[PDB]
């Protein structure tokens, strides 16, 4: 599926020291539905 998809640059409010940037590691969504405490994190890179 990765032949069609690609990593991207997206908005991040804090890229370091509270300054915003076009991040290659931008956070999309953090999922915390797992009762065991496991976090499913979505990022802009692959």
């Amino acid at each position: 599926v990765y032949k069609a998809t690609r990593p991207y640059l997206a908005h991040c409010p804090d890229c370091g020291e509270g300054h915003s940037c076009h991040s290659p590691v931008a956070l999309e969504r953090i999922r915390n539905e797992a009762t065991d405490g496991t976090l499913k994190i979505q990022v802009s890179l692959q």
Binding site: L9, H11, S20, H22, R31, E33, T35
Partner: protein
């Protein structure tokens, strides 16, 4: 011969019943009703769970004005922002300085968690009462499973049993109930399409497989930051997550009469509520004639040890002079005391030992062995309790 009696609706308590058929030797039957299940009829109104905010890529119309269209989606929100000049890594995204608009779109659907983490809203009506029992019949324990409606005859060893009808039609489950895993809650839940934001029912799904869901979550889209491509929004937090911490103690902990609450199916167990009538049509063969049964004479009773408690703390020795060898029924003629044994083997000029339970310090009771009565005088002492773990 039909024997009709009434026992309280309490599981794990053996009750003694004296069957006296005229011209036939008395019969003692021990009856015990273990579990008592009250299963209400359920009608699923809807399912609730944590919601999910579907936000696609914003429509940044460079050099033009975007238009919001009314979409039939749960919590659908659309807003067109004017005077937007967004930037990407390699400069500005739009050719124009002014006249660029951003169309922000958002709607609410069931989260991926909805199949795993969910609460069910049920309409509870007319609870069906069922009981597990045990009858000491002819020196053997027989199990009778019948509907406690008084119109379900169950025949075991030729004895016809008619259980109920229940004195109480109570079912620990108001008209509206909410089920979460192994916990049941009495809750006047909002109807479908009437759920409030940040509260139970902010997202409502008729079935867990349903495609179209109801949503009322306080979703409000905000103006994006200067030169920034993003969809900022303000939203009432998950009503299901809020209910999970605000639900309080379930029916298993709050229900009166020591009710135990179970799920799959939802039921009230051991809800010691009211009494239960029992009808037993005992066949002719089970009875023994008074002439065919031994005759009891020259009877005396002595109590060497007694403690007034819930269990059989009393011991009584009854001396007798029987006409022949045979089985004799043992029964207390005084309602204040109860005897453990229902039947004893009688010999000749011998003695019998019985175990009895009483609450009285000065216990005056009559014991009927076969067809003759004997007076027992008992001075019972207090127990240690204290506290016992059964």
């Amino acid at each position: 011969y039909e024997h009709v009696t009434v026992i309280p609706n309490t599981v794990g308590v053996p009750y003694k019943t004296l069957v006296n058929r005229p011209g036939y030797s008395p019969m003692v039957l021990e009856m015990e009703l273990l579990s008592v299940t009250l299963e209400p009829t359920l009608s699923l109104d809807y399912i609730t769970c944590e919601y999910k905010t579907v936000i696609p890529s914003p429509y940044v119309k460079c050099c033009g004005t975007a238009e919001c269209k009314d979409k039939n989606l749960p919590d659908y929100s659309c807003k067109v922002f004017t005077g937007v000049y967004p930037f990407m890594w390699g400069g500005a995204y739009c050719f124009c300085d002014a006249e660029n608009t951003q169309l922000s779109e958002a709607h609410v659907e069931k989260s991926e968690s909805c199949k795993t983490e969910f609460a069910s809203a049920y309409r509870a009506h007319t609870a069906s009462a069922s009981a597990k029992l045990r009858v000491l019949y002819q020196g053997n324990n027989i199990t009778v499973t019948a509907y406690a409606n008084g119109d379900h005859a169950v025949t075991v060893k030729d004895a016809k049993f008619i259980v109920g009808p229940m004195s109480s039609a109570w079912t620990p489950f108001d008209n509206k109930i909410v089920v979460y895993k192994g916990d049941v809650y009495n809750m006047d839940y909002p109807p479908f399409g009437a759920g409030r934001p940040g509260q139970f029912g902010d997202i409502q799904s008729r079935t867990p497989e349903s495609k179209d869901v109801y949503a009322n979550t306080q979703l409000v889209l905000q103006r994006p930051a200067a030169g920034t491509v993003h969809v900022p929004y303000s939203q009432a937090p998950s009503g299901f997550k809020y209910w999970l911490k605000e639900r309080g103690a379930s029916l298993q902990h709050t229900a009166p009469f020591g009710c135990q609450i179970a799920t799959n199916p939802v039921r009230a167990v051991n809800c010691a509520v009211g009494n239960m009538p029992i009808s037993i049509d005992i066949p002719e063969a089970a009875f023994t004639r008074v002439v065919d049964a031994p005759s009891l004479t020259d009877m005396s009773c002595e109590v060497p040890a007694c403690t007034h408690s819930s269990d059989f703390g009393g011991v009584a020795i009854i001396k007798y002079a029987a006409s022949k060898k045979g089985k004799c029924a043992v029964h207390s003629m005084t309602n204040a005391v109860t005897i453990r044994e229902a039947e004893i083997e009688v010999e000749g000029n011998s003695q019998l030992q019985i175990s009895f339970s009483t609450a009285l310090a000065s216990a005056e009771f009559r014991v009927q062995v076969c067809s003759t009565q004997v007076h027992c005088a008992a001075e019972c002492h207090p127990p240690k309790d204290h506290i016992v773990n059964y």
